[PDB]
Symmetry: D2
Subunit: 261 residues, 4 copies
């Protein structure tokens, strides 16, 4: 079908892209980076996150594949030496698609902006002290004082969420997980402490208490938002689709990245 290939842009990744393009030319494969059906990302997880966001408006028409030219990625989980076998198996098609949940972020002003995250969305203050009221399904749950909050997809749980103490969640679970960044807890100030895992259709809303300027990140993108009234998180109805050609289970991917490989 139509395909395209992003590269991290170092010499290794560019030349592997040029070779795969050449191998694709020997099949009924057309390079189209406007409406691809296959997006191959060559580089690391940062390169893969860029490719997701380049094509986030055509998620349902696209299957993604990551090739790691450095260390193993959680998303970029094919090796460079497998690239020619990848070209072949994929020109034919007849591959399985695997789908992972995404996180929808809505930011409301005094106007709305929506974003999709594959790893996580985080909120930190814009200089002052971060204080937000945390409301779950319209129920006021807690007043959070500290550095910030992190809302993670299942496949993001091994990224920032992990470094914050979060649980690792199998990506077949349709959920999102909220972790704390350095909460204050004393006599007058109380947060839950524990990470929180929310199912589909639960809405977690962050509302400002005084300062209304926040630094909001979505995966690698970090935007200073002013005059913010609300930040709403829920599990997205949209999913990212991977093309799979072999069994590479999530927990094995986890063992390989963190225990040893």
């Amino acid at each position: 079908m139509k395909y395209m290939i992003t590269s991290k842009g170092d010499e290794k990744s560019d030349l592997l892209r040029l070779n795969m393009i050449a191998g694709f030319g020997e099949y009924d494969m057309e390079y189209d980076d406007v409406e691809p059906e296959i997006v191959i990302s060559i580089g690391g997880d940062g390169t893969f996150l860029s490719a997701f966001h380049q094509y986030e408006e055509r998620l349902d028409e696209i299957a993604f594949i990551g090739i790691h030219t450095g260390h193993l990625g959680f998303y970029a989980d094919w090796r460079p030496a497998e690239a020619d076998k990848l070209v072949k198996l994929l020109a034919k098609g007849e591959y399985q698609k695997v789908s992972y949940p995404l996180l929808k972020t809505t930011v409301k002003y005094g106007k709305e902006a929506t974003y999709l995250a594959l790893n996580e969305s985080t909120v930190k203050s814009s200089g002052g002290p971060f204080v937000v009221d945390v409301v779950i399904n319209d129920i006021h749950f807690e007043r959070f004082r500290g550095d910030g909050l992190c809302m993670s997809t299942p496949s993001g749980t091994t990224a920032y969420n992990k470094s914050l103490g979060g649980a690792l969640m199998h990506p077949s679970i349709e959920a999102m997980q909220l972790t704390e960044m350095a909460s204050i807890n004393n006599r007058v100030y109380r947060t839950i402490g524990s990470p929180l895992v929310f199912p589909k259709h639960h809405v977690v809303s962050l509302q400002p208490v005084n300062d209304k300027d926040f630094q909001i990140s979505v995966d690698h993108l970090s935007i200073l938002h002013r005059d913010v009234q609300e930040i709403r998180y829920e599990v997205s109805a949209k999913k990212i689709h991977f093309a799979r050609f072999r069994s590479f289970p999530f927990w094995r991917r986890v063992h390989d990245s963190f225990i040893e490989d």
Copy 2:
């Protein structure tokens, strides 16, 4: 229908049981503690856990209700002053049933024993050093050295799991969560560290490395098991059913128990 009432056995709880029994006698309600359809537990979460285990072989025919005569429970979430309104609404029926996941534990010797947990199951060594190989869906994930492991239901996530650093999980999510107890981590010894959340149909198996004697707990019950070859955890196909008469959301129950009430 047929009903029964367990009491914590202090004066407050016994007398509230006697009064509810009296109120039930004014309806088509028959006290039967052999085949009840309604099990009311009066006391705290420990009393409720006992009632679950007393009737674990008739989970599908029974709806449970907890009355907390001390502080609020996660399971025992009606107040004593509501008891007469409880008698009434429940003689009529026309109540909704709510179902929470359970954890199946299988212990294999060199023979099998199965247990159901509403809170969690834990494994600790029987005196020596605890070392177990942790295998996920037949894939060797890690060699765990430390005090022990805890496998939690969703509604157990606010119990022992919470004190071990685990995430709180909404009980609509069909999953189980594994936390570490004091793992050793140095140059030669590596565990994941993070809690792990597993979906339905994933099997987590613990296999001994040297010592084969373990202390296995299931909720409040703690059994020394000898000549153990394997401990297998999976989300149960069975569920516990609660009778609900009002909206009392899980996250509100969490806010009330941990943030303030």
Copy 3:
């Protein structure tokens, strides 16, 4: 002697300052905010931290006292109703002095700047990814990747250090304590994880790996530093002196702020 009084600047604190000034006028007490020997801070810990920094160049000639007009402070540990008894006991003198350690921070460019902290000093990146080599007494200890690092005095251990997982340290111990902010840890990236407690005369140095711009905080002051070659932490030879009129032990102060009061 010579004294001065800072106020948080709300009505409560201003008027308590005016009343204490009036009470001092009935003794051989002269208000001098250029070379005081007694500095009274009225407000909270933030007000007390400001007063420390206003007079950091005359630490050895000054005894400090904090009055908390809001909740109890760790530094501002007298109540407003005790103020008149404070005026009296202090005009006479004959009070004990108590001394707490401070943290020296040195920032080197390509030039040096020194700062003293009563709570802590922290380093975070200026937008990009924070990567620093951590060198202890000229020995390369670790390469830290993550959000940042926090170096705490003993009396700062109940502040930011606490929210980062650090240990609480009795202020009679001449030490400093380093905690991590969200470290990355996988196959290729390793930090110690644990907080580290250093004695006097140990030098902890942070050296940039790529980006050389950092946000460095000292207590409440936060400065963007450019062209930074090194950040050096050691226990200061200078100490802050408190005037004490009663026994109020540190662990009791800790119990009162965090367990209940």
Copy 4:
């Protein structure tokens, strides 16, 4: 002088002991395991802990040395190939002594027993729920509910203390550090959470609330104590002395054991 050598008792360690004994016979060295002045431990940290306890009543007359025949130890920090150079440098003497703090544990009944720990002392319940009142210098600090408590020396901070979230403390600091094992924390139950570091002459006392039977461990030794009224921890006035022949700094030892070697 008089010396002796303990072995882990596998073939490697026994034969290295026999060779060092032979090398010592070529000097004015007499093997005496009743009143040695030099105690060499061959094996790992467990072997070294045994040697400390074998000779705990002659700590001040003895210098200790550890040889690691397996991985590097924190105590057993010479390699087997250095053994002949060790024999030589040590027959001459003219070595520096290095001293580390120890922890005194006192257990009172209704009678007293004292123990010295080089790593830590821990208290866990004997089957039931562990509840103890924690009293610091006769001030009631907290009521601890959970699995247990761990009191660590500075050189023990890299052992059990580390796995419990404690800080690593340089052994020149005369202190002890208390960590929690799985504390319960909700609306009605509050502990500090953070590790606590205590200086010399502070006394931390654990007093039973209901159950008075506890499992008390001291380093590798674990004793069930009945009819316990109190457990008192303080930094010992006694110290353990190491013989040093080279610079091997603590933080380097830490880097080598946990970061990589």
